[PDB]
Design a protein around this ligand. Structure first.
Ligand SMILES: CC(=O)SCCNC(=O)CCNC(=O)[C@H](O)C(C)(C)COP(=O)(O)OP(=O)(O)OC[C@H]1O[C@@H](n2cnc3c(N)ncnc32)[C@H](O)[C@@H]1OP(=O)(O)O
Ligand SMILES: CC(=O)SCCNC(=O)CCNC(=O)[C@H](O)C(C)(C)COP(=O)(O)OP(=O)(O)OC[C@H]1O[C@@H](n2cnc3c(N)ncnc32)[C@H](O)[C@@H]1OP(=O)(O)O
Lengths: 394, 213, 4, 394, 213, 4
């Protein structure tokens, strides 16, 4: 079913909401995990895409989520996809009450359903290929001159495009699906200053970990196979201690550790995935400078991560990791109403900024975010947020 | 005693350098005036030049309502004039900004407005004076001069909304902090110091072959 | 100079 | 006994160390606690002084402490002094091992011994009083002109000074002595970047609280009277919970709460002391802006402090408070060797900056701090750090 | 086609404004040269002028060893010269700094040194060339040219120490990051842009009646 | 421009 169906089935009955599913243009990027030179199998291509969502109520935004999906291709039919959950926030300006927990789980169900091949149709290359082009390497003089010699010679000032420079791939509809996230509460992630709002509920470290752990639990049971790999890791804690939280989980296979183990290449840098704004990436790049990357084993990485302040002087954080196959075969190219794919990074940023760029220390910002987001979609993109009729009893 | 001489001289320089800077500055102000004269002449021949510059400039979008762009798309000309040339009664930092809008059928009027910005005493803050402008017919609801009571609950609500539009920026003065268009001074300065002086840099960037800039 |  | 005696009696035997006791010029300042208009007794004068210490070993600095002493005068003989412990740090560049805990306790013993009257001799007024002066309100032209008309008329360029504009007070040698501190671990406080050093030991929230709690315990037993008031407060914790830590203490009168209670004026702002860089001051000034100062009772203050992130998303912090009379009568004007009192705020800052201004991500900074500090004292002040022969067995 | 005209013109301006700025700048450079000539003449009559300025300037102390002040106390003159005047073969931002030290009996020699700073290609970073100077006799231990091996353990130790003295700043080039005097470029710029141009502001501040400034 |  569609994104629109999913959200409605978790929002209160009779109630009306609106939402925004923004999506980046799938860009061919470097490997999620740093590859080693002398290695049999290294990635062929890594396709990165961002899904950013926001919910609105009565003309106010109140929730947002930012998730990256990474599709890695090793060869012909050997693929693999990873869903990385970056940020999730609320600003406490919802007039009504809702389960953010269920909204968040639902949006991930949706993402899980998407056929990986969807990000593989047209992919923006990291570096592309008769001259006479105006690009970043074009002083304004050059550019104006160019438009001159292109007017004098041609009727107008545009060219030819058939234009196909724009990658394309395939892989099996059912692949290995990974989910990775790093819990770390903070006053706000996507709604600046919203922490100054009294009605905003902040989870603490231990509260957040359980919160996320429950959502993944639900996804493990309902969306994955009974042999799926579920790993939990709580930096600064005892394996006995974590096993105790895990006794809380309803899914049977939760174990301590992570999904990076691999006895092949037992060296941190060749195993640890590097995501946006992630502490794992952080600590890795820290070693790159202080030159130790080829000296810290995977085992040591975790032990050292715990030290060096950050974790040592901050509340409970956890690393969750999932790795298995989904019950149903993920096969769902989202409709124009499931997603909005801006023409460029520039437009993507600009629409996002209407939200993550506002000041939420008052209801003003959250109302501003809503109007600016619809006005803009309508004006410059000829669209409009989706409306929702909630349909969940009690 | 030859020290009382040195010191007394150094003081003269001290009261001088102030009036010297004013000079090196007015020199630039002058050198640049005709340069913009020429450049503007060309610009005026280019279709949609300013509509394009103002949708390309990334920072400018942040100051104003998304909806204002329907009216901003209608800017035929922007001319910045540094007052210090027309009389030494002005701060080398003072300037006026003239806009021309080509209106829209049955919604927004055609018009040309000049808002004046000049530094006021106290290092000096930048201030302005309100100036008339014909708010779009769409913006009736949030029109300050169409609101019966700005202090009423639904009155303060609609008013604060209109104060976030670029039309609301034409009222900004700099003297009622928190009350008027937000950062009206920063925006003015953006025009005088970045947009106007570099419009061409942004037009050329809007003109990149291939969607993805 | 906040910017939004 | 002298500061020199104190430290030596806590540093290892035969061992040699050096240290710096820097002291600000006692400045008449505003009240520690915000006074209410319609109040019978409000402060007559508040004298603030800063004591800043550093220890050195083998040409490296490795420890520093910054404590303010506040002497408040209500009238003729009704005085009161408060010792506020602001910062304490290490950079983990001590070649040898030492008990920072004992060094820190010792330095506070010392401070406790000082006769309050010492800060009362000459006090720099907040605002002072035939013209012709060169002051902050003197353009450079004015100043040069002045030096001109002062040369032409006089032999030189200086004036007359007898000059007495410089306050002076007295109070009883034995007064009410308060000690206030707010535990809050952090990667570093006085040694920038030192957290990047591997050999530096960082306490966590619960570790720090016990650390401080033990030092005050020692001071309560050894330096105060058996009816002294000792209060502990752990924001975000249960009165049952705190009572459990307190069962650890050797001093019998530790109770939950703080030393601000006072049923007189049950309103936060008229009770809470405002110290440099203190969270209490922080949260108060937060209310001044959002205009609630006259609406938050003392009781509520503590309950609200816990919320609004900060505490909600940070490790264990405690508020310690002491209030009683010292066993021995504090009566000890420190010698030229107990303290170094820079000629001005400007020189004070400058010497301090040699230490708190360095970069300690390497031994270089800590060595630089040492040399620059002695070179300077010798050059511009004609002094030199004190040397210590440690004398503590095992 | 009238658009190909406008555009082709705008490009001319674009290659022009670069050479125009160079002009408004050289104007200032010129206007200011004689002004410093006068001012310096007076300054040279004032005893201890620079010793006083350099111990008053708060930020300057941070760049150098406390001990260097014994030698810094000996600076009779500091003269900053902007190269762009002596030939258009220099960046409007290039400049030389001339110091004069009156030495000390049996320790530090008397001397006058000129270090040259000019921007190098690549927006351009500021660079310099080493220049000779007679390090104090006290600083023998940490004298780079008195150290047999800079790579030896006790050799790298003493060398890095000398590289934190203001004498070590005379070697700085800008091309061996992390290896030479720390922030040598920021310090140079402090001289050319703050200390030299405002020496008098700091002398007057050193001259406050009452210890506490 | 660190400053020490
Ligand atoms: C890996 C990552 O993505 S990390 C991002 C983590 N994000 C942050 O730290 C940003 C700040 N945190 C927040 O904004 C939010 O608290 C979130 C997103 C973590 C959760 O929001 P919530 O609205 O608290 O959660 P949700 O609505 O599912 O309910 C959470 C619990 O608190 C309760 N709750 C809801 N509103 C409130 C309120 N105002 N006060 C107290 N409790 C409340 C819910 O009933 C529920 O309790 P239950 O389990 O007993 O039923
Ligand atoms: C209100 C205020 O003033 S708040 C300021 C609090 N400061 C900070 O957060 C700044 C960072 N913290 C630090 O720099 C330091 O850890 C301090 C000052 C808190 C304490 O320093 P320490 O050297 O750890 O303490 P001290 O030498 O007394 O010994 C502390 C304990 O750790 C042990 N220890 C000493 N060195 C080390 C080391 N390298 N590794 C592990 N443990 C060590 C000691 O034996 C002792 O344990 P014990 O009680 O079992 O004997």
């Amino acid at each position: 079913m569609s994104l629109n169906d999913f959200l409605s089935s978790v929002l209160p009955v009779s109630e009306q909401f609106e939402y925004l599913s923004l999506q980046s243009i799938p860009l061919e990027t470097h490997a999620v995990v740093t590859p080693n030179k002398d290695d049999k199998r290294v990635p062929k291509s890594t396709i990165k895409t961002q899904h950013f969502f926001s919910l609105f109520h009565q003309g106010k935004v109140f929730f947002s989520l930012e998730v990256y999906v990474y599709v890695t291709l090793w060869d012909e039919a050997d693929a693999e996809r990873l869903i990385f959950v970056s940020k999730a926030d609320t600003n406490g300006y919802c007039n009504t009450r809702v389960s953010v927990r269920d909204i968040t789980k639902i949006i991930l169900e949706f993402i899980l359903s998407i056929d990986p091949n969807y990000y593989l149709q047209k992919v923006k290359p990291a570096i592309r290929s008769s001259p006479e082009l105006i690009s970043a390497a074009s002083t304004p003089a050059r550019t104006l001159r160019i438009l001159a010699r292109r007017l004098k010679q041609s009727g107008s000032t545009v060219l030819k495009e058939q234009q196909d420079l724009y990658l394309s791939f395939t892989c099996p509809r059912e692949i290995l699906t990974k989910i990775c996230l790093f819990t770390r509460p903070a006053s706000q992630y996507l709604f600046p200053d919203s922490s100054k709002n009294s009605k905003k509920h902040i989870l603490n470290g231990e509260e957040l970990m359980k919160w996320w752990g429950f959502i993944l639990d639900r996804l493990l049971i309902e969306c994955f196979q009974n042999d799926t790999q579920a790993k939990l890791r709580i930096p600064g804690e005892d394996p006995a201690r974590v096993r105790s939280y895990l006794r809380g989980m309803k899914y049977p296979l939760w174990q301590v550790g992570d999904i990076f183990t691999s006895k092949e290449n037992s060296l941190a840098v060749y195993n640890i995935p590097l995501f946006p704004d992630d502490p794992k990436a952080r600590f890795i790049h820290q070693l790159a400078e202080e030159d130790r990357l080829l000296k810290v084993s995977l085992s040591s990485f975790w032990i050292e991560l715990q030290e060096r302040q950050e974790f040592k002087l901050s509340v409970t954080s956890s690393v969750m990791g999932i790795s298995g196959y989904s019950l149903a075969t993920p096969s769902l190219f989202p409709s124009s109403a499931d997603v909005i794919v801006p023409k460029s990074r520039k437009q993507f940023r600009a629409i996002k900024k209407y939200i993550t760029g506002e000041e939420y220390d008052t209801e003003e910002g959250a109302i501003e975010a809503f109007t600016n987001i619809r006005d803009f979609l309508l004006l410059r993109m000829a669209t409009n947020l989706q409306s929702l009729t909630g349909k969940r009893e009690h | 005693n030859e020290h009382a001489k040195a010191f007394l001289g150094l003081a003269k320089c001290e009261e001088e350098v102030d009036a010297i800077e004013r000079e090196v500055e007015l020199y630039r102000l002058n050198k640049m005036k005709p340069v913009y004269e020429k450049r503007d002449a060309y610009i005026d021949e280019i279709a949609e030049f300013w509509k394009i510059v103002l949708s390309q400039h990334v920072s400018f979008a942040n100051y104003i309502r998304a909806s204002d762009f329907k009216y901003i798309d209608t800017i035929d000309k922007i001319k910045v004039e540094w007052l210090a040339l027309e009389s030494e009664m002005y701060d080398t930092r003072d300037f006026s900004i003239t806009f021309h809008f080509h209106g829209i059928e049955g919604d927004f009027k055609e018009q040309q407005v000049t808002k004046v910005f000049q530094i006021k005493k106290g290092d000096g803050i930048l201030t302005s004076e309100p100036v008339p402008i014909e708010w779009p017919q769409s913006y009736d609801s949030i029109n300050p001069d169409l609101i019966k009571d700005k202090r009423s609950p639904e009155g303060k609500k609609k008013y604060r909304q209109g104060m976030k539009t670029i039309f609301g920026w034409f009222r900004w003065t700099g003297l009622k902090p928190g009350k008027e268009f937000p950062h009206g001074d920063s925006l003015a300065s953006l025009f005088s110091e970045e947009i106007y002086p570099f419009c061409v840099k942004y037009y050329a960037e809007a003109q990149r072959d291939l969607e993805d800039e | 100079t906040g910017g939004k």
